[PDB]
Amino acid sequence: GADGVGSSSGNWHCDSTWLGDRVITTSTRTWALPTYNNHLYKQISNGTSGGAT
Amino acid sequence: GADGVGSSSGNWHCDSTWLGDRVITTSTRTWALPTYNNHLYKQISNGTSGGATNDNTYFGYSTPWGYFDFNRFHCHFSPRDWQRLINNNWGFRPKRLSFKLFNIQVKEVTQNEGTKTIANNLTSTIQVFTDSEYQLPYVLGSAHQGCLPPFPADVFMIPQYGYLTLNNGSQAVGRSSFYCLEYFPSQMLRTGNNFQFTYTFEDVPFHSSYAHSQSLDRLMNPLIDQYLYYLSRTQTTGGTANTQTLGFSQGGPNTMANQAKNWLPGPCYRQQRVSTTTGQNNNSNFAWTAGTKYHLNGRNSLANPGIAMATHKDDEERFFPSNGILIFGKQNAARDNADYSDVMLTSEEEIKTTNPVATEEYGIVADNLQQQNTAPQIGTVNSQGALPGMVWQNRDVYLQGPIWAKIPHTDGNFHPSPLMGGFGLKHPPPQILIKNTPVPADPPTTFNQSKLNSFITQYSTGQVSVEIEWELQKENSKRWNPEIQYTSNYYKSTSVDFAVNTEGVYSEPRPIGTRYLTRNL
């Protein structure tokens, strides 16, 4: 079908299966992604100048 | 066509159909699903540590999920149809059912200051799955509240799902089992989706609706004598000095109580009798003390209702067994300590033929062994198990009553007819689960491992439609005189039965038994 705002993209799958010597385990979780560093690559460093050993 | 926000998923269907011995009744209702437990599986328990008595101690969990329960008849049958069914048909059983779920909406609500507002959230989803393999604790069959409302215009809230497990005190033992519902395959739907599935019932005997025009003991010919003899006389008579002797006579019209008989009444487990007349009853509160109870695992349990029996004998209608009968509350009856006038009592009188009266003993047997030296004695059996050659009737079903119950899976069972009445099943219709998909709030910028406890307040509504094809067993009988039927009262009323009141609150003035037509033993 033609995908859009109406349809759902994929179906929840969390399951396991035991077949002979095969075992198939699939999982699903819900994630949330915030924006980091205000869209900026930043240099980070630490040294003996500060309290660092 | 290509489905989307523009189109409607499915069309409203509430209808019935009568074809030969088939009758197909499908319904539709409008449902609303709130979010439960803030998306958290929670341990629940109660024990003697609190005010709980030892019997009501439990251990279990309350899931965020929710389920659909159509198990009650008045979902699927208008009173009118339920009038035709019981008048013209001996028996019936279900065959196959269909289920559709469609036209989902999702709405996110906020509280700002002291005001509320609501808007359509398009992208959000909900989860649905059905356990075909019965891999979950099966919670239906206890006739909990929250089935589909009888009067279709109503809109009902979906109950919350939960279950109980082995408990010791308020604590739990090793065999205690725990579940995670998100661990199953489940289909996810947005506003542009629908969900449907089919099911078939296993072969189950037609529920009998009828009363026996005869009585179990009177099957004899009234005119003709039997050729068997019974012991009619232990003592000489008419003399000034009487001695023991043996004497016999044939069973005949005059004395029918002595005649041979081929069958026995059903089993009996006695109940205490209670009058609807207050003054007649003992003055005390005996309900829980005198209540007929059974004991399991060091834990007392009331037997509710108990096995099918006659409610009362001739003209005793003002009398009823303690817990023996089902009860239905009238509309807007008080939940607790409701007075008699607010509830509606079923009557089993139709089965007095085959089954014993609930308030009386099964029979009498001799306790001791007689001699020329000894006087014989008798004894009273209040509780009698099953014996060869017994026949019995199941308990009646009612327009409000539950349709089926899942037969527990055990080594073995005896005559699996659910006590509350219905169709016992090895494989009931699979229970359906549904939940809102949790959508986080704004997470922090700095990382943290702790799961996000904050959410958008959210709920979702839509349509649900259910189809059932009922098979019938037609009535064929040569009885001459007119039958008893179920009719509405002719005389005038302030308002019509089974119709909305002044305020549009639908109500059912009385329960409806299933047995009217007559058959012959």
Side-chain angles (χ1 to χ4, degrees), chain B residues 293-485:
Chain B
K293 298 176 297 298
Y294 70 93
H295 183 62
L296 171 62
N297 189 31
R299 180 184 295 177
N300 294 283
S301 176
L302 179 64
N304 193 27
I307 64 171
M309 295 177 184
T311 298
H312 59 78
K313 64 188 183 71
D314 295 345
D315 292 343
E316 300 308 318
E317 186 176 3
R318 72 180 186 278
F319 296 158
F320 64 98
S322 174
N323 57 346
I325 66 170
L326 302 179
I327 298 172
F328 298 94
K330 289 181 176 179
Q331 180 55 56
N332 195 29
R335 178 181 178 275
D336 295 342
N337 194 31
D339 183 70
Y340 166 73
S341 63
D342 288 343
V343 296
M344 294 176 283
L345 301 178
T346 59
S347 178
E348 296 304 320
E349 180 277 338
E350 295 78 354
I351 63 172
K352 288 196 297 183
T353 67
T354 301
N355 303 135
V357 175
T359 61
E360 295 176 351
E361 73 284 3
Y362 182 81
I364 300 302
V365 297
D367 291 346
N368 64 345
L369 180 62
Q370 67 178 18
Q371 294 175 337
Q372 61 177 17
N373 187 29
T374 64
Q377 292 179 335
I378 61 173
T380 297
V381 176
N382 290 342
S383 175
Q384 178 56 259
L387 275 66
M390 286 179 175
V391 295
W392 62 92
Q393 297 299 319
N394 291 337
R395 189 183 295 275
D396 189 3
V397 294
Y398 295 85
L399 181 63
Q400 295 76 352
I403 295 166
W404 64 81
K406 177 180 170 62
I407 297 168
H409 190 281
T410 60
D411 292 348
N413 55 33
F414 170 74
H415 186 61
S417 179
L419 296 172
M420 292 171 67
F423 304 97
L425 292 175
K426 298 289 181 62
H427 306 289
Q431 58 183 17
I432 295 173
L433 278 311
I434 187 167
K435 183 177 68 65
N436 299 134
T437 302
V439 175
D442 49 351
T445 61
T446 297
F447 177 81
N448 181 26
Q449 61 177 16
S450 65
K451 65 179 180 180
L452 275 65
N453 61 345
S454 178
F455 298 95
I456 295 171
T457 303
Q458 187 172 356
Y459 80 93
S460 61
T461 66
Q463 309 309 318
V464 60
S465 293
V466 58
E467 177 182 1
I468 295 170
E469 179 175 0
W470 299 96
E471 184 179 4
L472 293 179
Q473 185 170 353
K474 299 301 287 187
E475 170 275 334
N476 183 29
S477 174
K478 309 304 287 189
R479 175 178 172 176
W480 180 263
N481 67 345
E483 300 312 322
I484 295 170
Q485 297 301 319

Side-chain angles (χ1 to χ4, degrees), chain A residues 4-49:
Chain A
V5 296
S7 175
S8 65
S9 295
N11 295 337
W12 181 269
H13 295 290
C14 295
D15 189 4
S16 64
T17 300
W18 297 80
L19 297 174
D21 55 354
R22 296 288 187 270
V23 54
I24 294 171
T25 63
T26 187
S27 297
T28 300
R29 299 287 187 270
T30 299
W31 56 270
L33 183 288
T35 295
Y36 295 94
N37 282 340
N38 298 283
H39 309 286
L40 295 174
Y41 293 85
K42 293 180 176 179
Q43 176 177 351
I44 63 170
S45 179
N46 184 25
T48 185
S49 179

Side-chain angles (χ1 to χ4, degrees), chain B residues 155-193:
Chain B
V155 177
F156 70 96
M157 175 174 173
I158 289 171
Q160 182 177 354
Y161 181 84
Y163 61 94
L164 293 172
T165 306
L166 302 177
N167 63 339
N168 187 336
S170 65
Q171 294 175 336
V173 298
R175 294 180 185 82
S176 302
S177 296
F178 176 80
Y179 292 88
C180 181
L181 297 175
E182 293 79 355
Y183 190 76
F184 295 172
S186 60
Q187 188 170 355
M188 294 177 69
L189 287 49
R190 290 184 179 174
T191 184
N193 306 133

Side-chain angles (χ1 to χ4, degrees), chain B residues 79-312:
Chain B
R80 177 67 181 93
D81 290 344
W82 186 251
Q83 190 177 0
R84 292 182 184 86
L85 178 63
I86 61 173
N87 285 339
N88 294 286
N89 290 281
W90 279 348
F92 61 90
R93 59 182 180 186
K95 299 300 286 187
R96 57 189 291 271
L97 78 86
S98 297
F99 186 88
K100 290 179 179 176
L101 189 298
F102 60 90
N103 290 340
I104 297 169
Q105 295 80 357
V106 175
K107 298 180 183 301
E108 55 188 342
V109 60
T110 187
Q111 289 302 321
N112 194 29
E113 299 92 2
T115 188
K116 183 189 297 293
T117 190
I118 297 168
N120 288 337
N121 185 338
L122 299 176
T123 60
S124 298
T125 65
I126 64 171
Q127 297 172 334
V128 170
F129 72 93
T130 61
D131 179 2
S132 63
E133 291 178 348
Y134 304 95
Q135 298 174 336
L136 291 175
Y138 187 84
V139 72
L140 292 177
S142 296
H144 297 286
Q145 298 177 338
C147 295
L148 288 54
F151 181 73
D154 294 342
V155 177
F156 70 96
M157 175 174 173
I158 289 171
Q160 182 177 354
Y161 181 84
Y163 61 94
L164 293 172
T165 306
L166 302 177
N167 63 339
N168 187 336
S170 65
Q171 294 175 336
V173 298
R175 294 180 185 82
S176 302
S177 296
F178 176 80
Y179 292 88
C180 181
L181 297 175
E182 293 79 355
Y183 190 76
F184 295 172
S186 60
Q187 188 170 355
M188 294 177 69
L189 287 49
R190 290 184 179 174
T191 184
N193 306 133
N194 58 28
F195 172 77
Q196 62 183 19
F197 77 96
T198 62
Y199 174 75
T200 300
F201 294 98
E202 62 183 341
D203 294 344
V204 54
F206 297 94
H207 175 65
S208 64
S209 66
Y210 54 85
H212 293 294
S213 62
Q214 291 175 331
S215 65
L216 180 62
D217 58 352
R218 292 291 182 266
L219 299 175
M220 68 195 84
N221 184 334
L223 298 177
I224 308 302
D225 293 347
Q226 293 176 336
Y227 51 83
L228 299 180
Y229 290 88
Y230 64 92
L231 186 29
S232 59
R233 180 177 298 280
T234 307
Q235 188 176 358
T236 58
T237 188
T240 187
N242 286 335
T243 61
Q244 65 282 0
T245 187
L246 275 64
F248 305 94
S249 295
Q250 293 180 337
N254 294 335
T255 60
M256 300 183 294
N258 292 280
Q259 298 187 343
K261 294 182 174 74
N262 284 335
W263 306 102
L264 261 57
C268 181
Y269 184 78
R270 174 180 285 181
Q271 298 302 322
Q272 179 63 260
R273 186 186 71 191
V274 175
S275 175
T276 59
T277 298
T278 61
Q280 292 176 334
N281 290 335
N282 185 339
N283 190 29
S284 65
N285 191 31
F286 58 83
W288 174 249
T289 60
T292 296
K293 298 176 297 298
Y294 70 93
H295 183 62
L296 171 62
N297 189 31
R299 180 184 295 177
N300 294 283
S301 176
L302 179 64
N304 193 27
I307 64 171
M309 295 177 184
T311 298
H312 59 78

Side-chain angles (χ1 to χ4, degrees), chain B residues 34-50:
Chain B
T35 295
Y36 295 94
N37 282 340
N38 298 283
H39 309 286
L40 295 174
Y41 293 85
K42 293 180 176 179
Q43 176 178 351
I44 63 170
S45 179
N46 184 25
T48 185
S49 179

